[model samples]
Target chain A: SSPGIWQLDCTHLEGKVILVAVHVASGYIEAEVIPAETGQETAYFLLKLAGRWPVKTVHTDNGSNFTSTTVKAACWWAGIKQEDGIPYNPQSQGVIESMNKELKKIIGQVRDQAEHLKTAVQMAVFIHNHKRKYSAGERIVDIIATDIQT
Target chain B: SSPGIWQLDCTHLEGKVILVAVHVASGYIEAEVIPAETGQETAYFLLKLAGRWPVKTVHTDNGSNFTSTTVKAACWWAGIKQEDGIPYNPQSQGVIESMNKELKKIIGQVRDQAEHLKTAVQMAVFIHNHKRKGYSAGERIVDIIATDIQ
Candidate 1:
């Protein structure tokens, strides 16, 4: 069912940079607050995610962060295949595009009161990955558990 | 503050591989559908997207696709830096993780009835980026438009 694929992207919250990754099969998500959206940072996150999941492949846009030397070395060492979307074609990346929208929407609610943008992002992501549900009556977290157990 | 940074990753839909990238500053996204999730494909897509955007750096997990020689070369030729998330740390990639979840959930409803997973993804992305609101005066659309305008 093509469960091994995960989409990646980034966002800014309250002037802070956030990196994010998503699993397609279970709609599982992982997000991070980072110092900068540099290639080094991006590569680091990619490897971290790979270590957690049986990542067969990674896909991204042509941001230098995704296509840097360090990132290349990590992918080569990890034996994961990488793919990027067709240029200028937002339609191709419909999955993460919508997700970024949801994240920003959710985070905005608590941004002001949150101690830090990091905490706000963390809270927002927790809701997105664990608390939210699908119309078919499955929470994203539930789908993730089922996938892992299977 | 990390406007030039971008994070990248891949996801699969109905068995078709889709590559995705996101900009940290504007929260803008780009997605693609490809045949296989290979390093070559990922490299090609990264270069293609770099052509359109002013990507200074790219961040990703250590998936082979992001760390391949081809991807490295693409980053080199393009003058981009690459970064990966810290190892075994999911919180660092929270942004894209949540993003992937939202994308899958939005696309799932119409995925079964859509002509193709590609089409469904495109439709879903359009709704996410354009139709949704940010709760403030800005929607994801407004943020994107503002970023582009600036």
Candidate 2:
């Protein structure tokens, strides 16, 4: 079974956490924390995980890391088509962009101070995947695990 | 006889000389130099010369000085429809924009540094009107002038 597309964004949070999102087509989201300069490595990691499932497409912005030759080669090797949004036009990736906002809101509610960086991001992503209810009426993790197969 | 539509731009020359380009309907041109801070005044001066000649439209960029309320109100009062290009997109007014480039090139060719500013602008405008051939067949001066007057 072919899984839907995934969009990625790397966000730096006050020099504390480097947040990464892997948003699936069925309105499910997975996130991870890594160093700020690990964008290329993160892409490689995602590609490794994606190899276990059927990922047909990946979309990202025109960021240098995302468009790097390494990332491009990885996608090519994985048989996944890569799409990028136009420069300066965020609306091109509206869904994942909005997801970042939702993630921030949930993380803020759990963490009272900015010092709890790693834990806050982890809690936020876990809650989003397991607890968050989508308009389509499905939990993100359940949807991903059920629909995606090696 | 109907006058031409003159576009104005300021150069980095000493003193307050303004460059004005009068474009004709039959692709003809006439140009003049006036005192600085005279863009609004120049438009009014051209309108006076147009006497009984109806003007269909006038196009300018969003330069703060050019698009001032005073200049806009003057255009409205003169029964001329004013159009402005987008803030950053220079292609919206490519004609006059290209003319500015040509003007700069002419300024670059002059030998006398002292008279470079004034002489360059004058020579450029003169060449554009009388000497320089238009991209299309016909006298540029005549075309521009007739377009405005007719």
Candidate 3:
């Protein structure tokens, strides 16, 4: 696996809990609306998010769910490195914090127009991953895939 | 001219004043860093933006820059209907406000990485307009062009 570093963060929006996994370099994100902020749920989504690509590092804030036994066990079993950001310092995991806000804002914009919260989150994540920057006609997904496999 | 309804708003980020014009339906935005929040500059950009395509309506916040004589004259000459959102109610112009936040966040992320402020703003706008959502491979610019010509 390549030295790919991903950032993780959770946020509550519109009465729903969302866990976001962001590929830092390319800004590719997979944000899921979870039922709870429990370690079990976080581990479940973490596995799925990591399963999408070979990830070497998982940088997360010092949240209970992220520091829970289940999450540590999952990371150890998957052969991934786990790092915790500074306690009570959101900016230590700035990428994830930034992404959390972006996702929330996008959800707010599409909430009234979408049928459900899940749909809104999915759509917003999709939008986040496809936006072009630096390169014309190139999407976030395309940028990430250029050096990785599905 | 097509009956296009765009949203306009202004916000300051990194000590710079930005005027954002958003195609509400498509989410395409033209955000520029202006020297001053004057009607003359607003009208100048409005003309250039309206020149890109036919704009039937321009919905702006009730700011002096938007209501200035120069702005009104530009809108009147270009046949663009000028509509102002309720005074003191930011939510009245939700789209532009949302975009302003999004742009600011993106700029924050990319500023340290980009060379200059203009490049940062340009890249941020590019990213904003190219993100994927309901329709795969459909950039914001593409959505707007489906029913119009250059």
Candidate 4:
């Protein structure tokens, strides 16, 4: 069985920022905006999100801020395994890596520029989960609901 | 207490690559360079060097090539705390980060052109450690010898 890959992204506004954590397995998405990216900040973010979702594993590229010991220790304490992809090989986690691209495209179509892009990205993810259709497959929300119920 | 930051440049006949690692205490600088940044090759190189100069913590910025799980797990197993700086805040680890600029300046003086610049970069680090004055009023060669003996 393939391991579930959780792809996380954080976008910044002039003052506020948003972090999106998506589960590639069930196409589940959780988004948040934080003031900064720090180990303590990230730890709290993940802890809050983990309360709602039972994350078994997480996969991210070699982003320095994302790979903090605090993050690792947080995941370890949460009983979640932290998996980092090979350097420069985004393809290793193609499922969630592709989601970032998809979200960006949807954001581009709806937003005029980078300044307004944060809201557009948030809306895009909402629609992507609730309204959008997959490749002749099950709806993302349906899958997520089912997964949660199980 | 502030951590000691060291900027490392790895140069070869083929190309140039720079990496920085920090010492948690004493702020001592430990830097080196070999031929390449290949996964297995770099791991072996780091392992060998770490034997000579032990470190407790390492801080680095996330680049696509440097944040591999192989490297992270290796560091974890070795009991070295690995820290990745925030995505946008280069100043978080300004000590080693600034060394990149200093390295480039020396690279310019030593190499005639960009071709084989990696070798030039490596040589620059060599000279800087052995010949350059200590910013903290310590001797450079003496420091190297001390680290080498340990």
Collision count for each candidate, in order = 60, 23, 3, 4
Which stretches of model 1 miss by more than 4 angstroms? A87-92, A134-150, B1-150
**Candidate 4 chain B, which ten residues in sequence have the lowest lDDT sum?**
B134-143
| Model 1 accuracy (lDDT, Cα) | 0.62
Looking at model 3 chain A, which ten-residue stretch has the lowest summed lDDT? A134-143
TM, chain A, every candidate: 0.78, 0.68, 0.79, 0.62
Q: Using lDDT as the measure, which candidate wins?
A: 3
Give each prediction's DockQ, rounded to 2 decimals: 0.02, 0.00, 0.02, 0.01
lDDT agreement with native, every candidate: 0.62, 0.49, 0.64, 0.48
Stronger candidate by DockQ (1 vs 4)? 1
lDDT of 4 by residue, B1-150 (tens): 132232233423335345434333323333334455655444433432343233445554344325776556545544456555443555545655465666667767767632354445444544444343423211322233234333
Tell me the tens digit of each residue's lDDT in model 3 across A1-150.
333677777789767788877666666666677777888666656654543344678877457855699788657645568887554665546656676788889888878755567656765765565455632113333444444333
lDDT of 2 by residue, B55-109 (tens): 4455453366356766665465455666653435555366555656666676566
The digit string of per-residue lDDT tens for model 2 on A1-150 reads 224566667665656444453645455444556665554565554554343334567766447756687667657645667776453555546766677788888778867632346556654654564442442213323343444222
Q: Over 4 Å off in model 4, which ranges? A: A1-4, A10-18, A63-67, A87-98, A108-118, A134-150, B1-150
lDDT of 1 by residue, A14-35 (tens): 5668888777665667777898
- Tens digits of per-residue lDDT, candidate 1, B111-147, equal 7644566655654554444433432111332233334
Scored by lDDT, model 2 comes in at: 0.49
